[PDB]
Amino acid sequence: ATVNQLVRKPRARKVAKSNVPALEACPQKRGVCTRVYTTTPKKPNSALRKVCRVRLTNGFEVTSYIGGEGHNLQEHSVILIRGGRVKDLPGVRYHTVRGALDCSGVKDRKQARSKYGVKRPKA
Amino acid sequence: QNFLNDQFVIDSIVSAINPQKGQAMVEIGPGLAALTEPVGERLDQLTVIELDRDLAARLQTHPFLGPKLTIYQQDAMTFNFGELAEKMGQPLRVFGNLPYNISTPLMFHLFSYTDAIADMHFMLQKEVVNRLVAGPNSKAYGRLSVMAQYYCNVIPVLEVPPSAFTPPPKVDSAVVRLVPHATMPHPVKDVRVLSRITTEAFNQRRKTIRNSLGNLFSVEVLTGMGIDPAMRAENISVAQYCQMANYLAENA
Amino acid sequence: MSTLEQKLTEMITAPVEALGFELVGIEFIRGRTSTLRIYIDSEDGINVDDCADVSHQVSAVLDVEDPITVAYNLEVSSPGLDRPLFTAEHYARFVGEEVTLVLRMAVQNRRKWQGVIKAVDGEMITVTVEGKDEVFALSNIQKANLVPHFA
RNA sequence: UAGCUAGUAGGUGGGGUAACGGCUCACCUAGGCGACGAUCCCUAGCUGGUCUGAGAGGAUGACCAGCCACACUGGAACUGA
């Protein structure tokens, strides 16, 4: 509408949140697994999802996804988390990091292994 | 018409009822076997009314249930619960689920037996339950909730989503329990005076009570009772309503 | 909240005890999904992997004979750093320890609580609620949690 | 977040500073400010710049250079250019 309205009130460009706010723009954060559990997604859905309630150093507690194979991971253990969305799951916007401070690499895996926290085979 | 479908909330209701011997328990509207079985199970023996004689045959012929209950086949609004309270040795626990047009009648018939009933435990639709427990100063308040809260203390038990029912309605519904007062906290000279005071008032709920109860009492009576006649009918607690009822009855 | 809680417990007990793990808690919630939550512990330990195992087992062995399957999904869990707990014996392991409780009784001197377990009765939890002490029946409670001190 | 303000706004006179000035003090006037957003509350050191953007813009002020403020916290004041 009128330029006179625009000088009476300028263009209100909107703000948006961090969609992964419990990082406070840290590239990663540390926490402890306040509980750990595994879920079927649905009545016919067989693909178990592995998930943790984890409290961060900043006192937030949040859900995070456990990617790939099993671990030692059990409630007194400590975890590094980073941004990442499990698209099918509700609100799961944090991935745990493979090969982090209390976290094993996927020993078996021969492909993409720098994602999975695992060193070059020793050949 | 409806009856429940899902074991989680069936089990929640029958467990929240806490149905055991040492209680004069009677079902009304046993309906589908799934929700009458756990209560007929936990009570060593149980009384029941079904309104339908065909369902009463289905359940009386069921060997889980016919050997484990005593069964009656009639409109419960005919039924002499005051004699059943004598036959059951102590005032009754009356409970269940129904098509509930009859609900409004159920409450009055239960209240005709406030002596003979120890407590009532029933499912009902969300709006009528929230009305039944409504605080005096709310739009949910009104004459039937007044009479209910007069007769009994009233207590929501738990609330149930519509997909929980066998024919699932659109309408969320809750089980509620209520307790005829061991002595009436509001002593009244008569209940017909309450019933007519409340209907006159709520038939006129938008205007001042000077233009509702002041069509019968004077403003100097009302202010003499300590009541501001400039209030609306939905500002008024059951306490001053029973005070008005006593005033009507004793000054007549 | 559960279906047929004893039947469910035994059907779950079969893979739990085949794995040599132990049950702790069974609870179901009704909502956007309707879903079943199993607390398992084993004092050598429960990993995510142990949950994964017993969960894939129950995801078969319950499903094939489900008494109900409405909106269904489930999870199996370690009982948290603040732990849900359910029986006289549980609170008895934890006499002297801080707790929170929510109850089937719902009345003033509020039956929603923070407590330190004072002692256990065969029918009741006795507890230092609000720095006072009082006692609540295992039947008049409905959910409780332990060491809420840990966030 | 709508009204704000009594050394408040202005004046005279005394005192005061290296210097002008409610700077301050006596009196005297009743002003002065604000919806062209005062008052109030939150948040922030500022700037040359930096990043992005075709540009207009948007973001931002680490490093380096200029300015500002602070020096255990809160108060003062000595000395000296």
Next chain:
RNA sequence: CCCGCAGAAGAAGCACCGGCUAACUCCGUGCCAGCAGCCGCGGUAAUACGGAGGGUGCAAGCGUUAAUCGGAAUUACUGGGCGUAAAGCGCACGCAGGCGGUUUGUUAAGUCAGAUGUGAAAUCCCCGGGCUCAACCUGGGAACUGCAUCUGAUACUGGCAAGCUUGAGUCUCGUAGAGGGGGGUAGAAUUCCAGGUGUAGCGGUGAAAUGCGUAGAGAUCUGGAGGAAUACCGGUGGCGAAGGCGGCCCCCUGGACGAAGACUGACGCUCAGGUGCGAAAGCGUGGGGAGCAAACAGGAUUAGAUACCCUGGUAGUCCACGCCGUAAACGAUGUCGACUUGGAGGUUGUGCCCUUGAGGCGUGGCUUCCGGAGCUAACGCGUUAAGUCGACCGCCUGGGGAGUACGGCCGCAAGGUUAAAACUCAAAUGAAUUGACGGGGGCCCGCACAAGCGGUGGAGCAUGUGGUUUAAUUCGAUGCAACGCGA
């Protein structure tokens, strides 16, 4: 930094390979679970899972996360929208604010031109130089959009002065109209009362019942009461800002349009706050209460029926005086002004011609329906724009959460009003296309029916099928469209 010496000698990884997106096949795998930015991948091969070979990309790095800008015109200064997708205040008046016809002089604030001072250096950019190159460093220029001051310029804008009549507005004469306010009054009508005649029914529904009547109802005649509303005209019709306005007469009163001049002399438009008007419902105070009728009450119906039916019936509906302040208060379309093909009507003035009376040439106003151009997502809109444009105002920025919270304000109370966010979702939405629609609805067709003939269905027996039985009664076909059928 140069020089000597020996030897390929001491020195390559990391992503990804379904599409977007360069790069693919074998293998397993079983939806085991893995895979994931998104779209999505998978059971029997999976180019998407895991492994292998093969490939692509980038490289002493390569990937992941976070964060800002981009893309995003996705706040739209440049560079967006508001009939239906989100969006035009229910309406109007009006203060502040913005905007403003036309002619001449004047001014020179804006504006323009030029100058002068300043705009730290570094950075940026250009042109060079120097490190073996590069990064890096560095000379010189350019740049520093600006600010101040001086000087001119005078179109335009602003100021000032003077006018001007086209906008605005006054006057004179008419015209049409449910415009408003106030006061009388009429004929129907219902109910009610009072009789009169009269008598077994009435009333109601699908049928019933409740209801009314032998104290005479119902019916019908007369007489009276009271409250409410204006049959018909009446219209694709008028008036009104909108809400709205309809028997008739009077009284007061608002606006509008045409006629023909005359007059003022830009007096204008828009309008945040502000002010006022504002259906229906409801409230306030005091009347009234015929008919109707939430609530209520009672009879019925129904599996139930709270509905739908009926007999009742209060508030309310009416009036005066307060309030509320909302409506799909919607042309879902802000106000004002200019322009831009046509066509058929309606209504209401007016001029000229009328041969009169009809006519026929014109010519305003209002208004309805078509439709060109253009516009529009499309639907459609279309000189009464949703076309072409000028001034100002209002409003929107994904869907839910939510016009909801909270606070403020306002209200007698209802509530109104202003108005979040967390949280949650990959949509939500508008128009339009093709099937379902389907319940059909019609066009109709044939030994389909009808009109005939001869059967079948009862008897015996041939034959198939079934059931049953058996050591086996082999197996297949089982309504048409299996059953003397494969055979």
Next chain:
RNA sequence: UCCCGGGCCUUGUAACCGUAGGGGAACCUGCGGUUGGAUCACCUCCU
């Protein structure tokens, strides 16, 4: 006309708004305004 299929053109097939009140329901009722008077949608592909 009907009775059986077909072939064929194609429809006998209320929502809301504001507001006030009931309240087994979504709902029922009163007042007056608006018309925006209804459907629903599965097995692959390159020049």
